[PDB]
Amino acid sequence: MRITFNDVKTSLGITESYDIVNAIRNSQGDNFKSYVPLATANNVAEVGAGILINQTVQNDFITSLVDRIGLVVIRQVSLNNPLKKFKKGQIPLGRTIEEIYTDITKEKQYDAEEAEQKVFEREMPNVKTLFHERNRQGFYHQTIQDDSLKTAFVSWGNFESFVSSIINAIYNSAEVDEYEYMKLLVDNYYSKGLFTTVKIDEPTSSTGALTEFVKKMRATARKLTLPQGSRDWNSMAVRTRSYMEDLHLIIDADLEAELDVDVLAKAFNMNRTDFLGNVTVIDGFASTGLEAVLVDKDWFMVYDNLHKMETVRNPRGLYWNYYYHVWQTLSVSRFANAVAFVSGDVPAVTQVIVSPNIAAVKQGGQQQFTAYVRATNAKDHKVVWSVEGGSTGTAITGDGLLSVSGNEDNQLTVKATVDIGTEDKPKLVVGEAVVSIRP
Amino acid sequence: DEPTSSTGALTEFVKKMRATARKLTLPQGSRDWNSMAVRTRSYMEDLHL
Amino acid sequence: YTDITKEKQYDAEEAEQKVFEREMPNVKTLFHERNRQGFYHQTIQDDSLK
Amino acid sequence: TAFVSWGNFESFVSSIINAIYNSAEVDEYEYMKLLVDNYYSKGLFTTVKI
Incomplete structure (x- = not known):
């Protein structure tokens, strides 16, 4: 192979803001007057920046010898990331990491007449997991x-x-x-x-x-x-x-x-x-x-x-x-x-979080959902509850109480929506949770 | 805007210079400060203003 | 100057036939x-x- | 600018200097050979037919 290049201009990809040579030449002298006495200013400005491509240049005295290369420099750099302190150990075997958290419960008023018929009731703990x-x-x-x-x-x-x-x-x-x-x-x-x-x-x-x-x-x-x-x-x-x-x-x-x-x-x-x-x-x-x-x-x-x-x-x-x-x-x-x-500038509402993201209920059971709105401003917004189960008899109370019809078999999606956009151009922030049906 | 128009302009010029000098010498480097876009880094003892 | 390289996605099916493929390093030179x-x-x- | 080492530079200068003496020797040889031709052409030169 013999790779050669012919007739390459010395300013390949340069889009000059202004012509320095012309500006120096046609200046009566207000700021460029210092470069007027310079003799080789044009020649210096021609090759002011490094030449992208080298071409063989004959000697000026004897136009048979070729000008040589005098110095060669090698540039080396070392780079690393400063965030390595945020890295944990190594996982040789396995693929998925499971993280589990448990929240707190709610206080109940002490009642003796009301405690007769619900000694054995269940209060499911609030737990939630995520996977990586x-x-x-x-x-x-x-x-x-x-x-x-x-x-x-x-x-x-x-x-x-x-x-x-x-x-x-x-x-x-x-x-x-x-x-x-x-x-x-x-x-x-x-x-x-x-x-x-x-x-x-x-x-x-x-x-x-x-x-x-x-x-x-x-x-x-x-x-x-x-x-x-x-x-x-x-x-x-x-x-x-x-x-x-x-x-x-x-x-x-x-x-x-x-x-x-x-x-x-x-x-x-x-x-x-x-x-x-x-x-x-x-x-x-x-x-x-x-x-x-x-x-x-x-x-x-x-x-x-x-x-x-x-x-x-x-x-x-x-x-x-x-x-x-x-x-x-x-x-x-x-x-x-x-x-x-x-x-x-940030939207008024950032996100809506429903506390139970995943739930499982019976055909005749009920579920309760609580929504948190992440609002940037100080004013509050009201949520709207909806269900896209697609079966009749299943409706959700405006407070967040989902009731399931006794005859259905489908995967339920419960949505909480907040409207923040202006009239004629509604903007919706939606947080939804998934419910399974136990027959 | 101007380094001599007002004291606020001078202070914001100083802030910009310090920010640029700090981000020039980050260990991970950058390719948005030289004519040829290559990942390179500088040093405080080598920088000149 | 030598300027890093670009990463590729792991693929055994392509590696089955691209064992000896060449990847030219990113080198930039200039002259003064x-x-x-x-x-x-x-x-x-x-x-x-x- | 056409050389990297000094020794090549002095060698080239020495060759340039020696070229003058080589040319002088060649021209002297030609000038001294011209005498025989001139003397034969003037007819003052004894000849034998072969």
Whole structure:
């Protein structure tokens, strides 16, 4: 093979804002006057940036010798992800992880006349589970052809350095892809309204807004660790409690700079105005309004299942093939506190959670459903209950009491709907639960 | 907008510079700060303003 | 410069026939030439300056 | 700019220098050979028919 290129211009993919040579030339002199005395300004500007493609250039004195290459430099970089501290151990066998949680019950008034006929009644405990699966299986494939690459180098050091650079790149790719997947986890969690949104804007003070975001974040962190617990900071609407030593906070570079400049510099004894939980800084979030994410240590459910490399050699083609196989499971637990701080426009209602997601009832039985509405504003909204079982005799009370007709065999879906859109363009937030029929 | 128009503009310019400098030196790197889009990282002792 | 690579999905059925397939690494090169070539000229008339 | 090592540069300069002496030797040989032809053409040169 003899690969050649002919008649390639020195500025291939350059879309200049303005012509520097023409601007210097036709300037009477207001800001470019310093470059007028320069003699080789045009020649310098012609090759100011590196040339994409090299072409053979004859010597100016004797137009028979060819100008040579004097210096060759090899650029090498090392990359890794800072979120490796959020990874748990390894799962050699098995595929699915099951997480179980139990909620609290409700108090009943002490009555003696009413306790005669229901000594043996049942009060089913509130429990709920979720499952995490193995969902990442990838490999990185790279070939090295040393015999063909030997012609591109003169010294024996550059060749080895180039091979080492390829070997380093085959690992840097996985190192950056793991970080990309972990960030995609948070982005996907926010993309479906599973985060509890806290608005940074609306200071409601008219005198000071620099400290509003830090005040709100400190208040949220303080109320996350209340001993009595709360149901307002998780997607399962279960009474849970968090600890300050287990609270992590992923913040943006802009947010970190704002904290460092606006408040920390002008604040004496900044120990009482800095952040509370552990702090990590990333490049930013792909979501429009995301600025910071405050989560719990047990929020991440990332595990590794396989990490290996295998090499093969083709002797007919005289090359090496490297395959780096990585298998991982990436998931996030819904039973942990997780809030997201936003500084834009958000819908009035984020999500609706029905307490029993999965239920089983008899033909003549009944069920009770409770709905929680995650509203960004302070005003409340009313829910509407519906059932899409498709059999007559089955109806749901407006308070959330589902009654099943005595003659039916179908899978019941119970929907709670909140209307937030304006008239003539309704917007609906729907949370539904599944019910099975026991004959 | 302007680094000399007002003290607020100067402060936000400083904030932007600090944010950019911090995100240039992250370990995972980025490909949105050079002419050729390649994943590369810088260092604080190597950055010059 | 060498700039990482792209990952592929695991597939034994395709690996059954693509064992020896080649994947060229992502390598980018650029070249810098010499462009500044000048001189400074000054004349001195010592006899006239005396 | 056409060389990487110095020794090649001095070798090229030495070849350029030696070219002058080679040309001088060749021209001297031609000039001295011209004398026989000139003397034979002028007819002052004894001849034997073969």
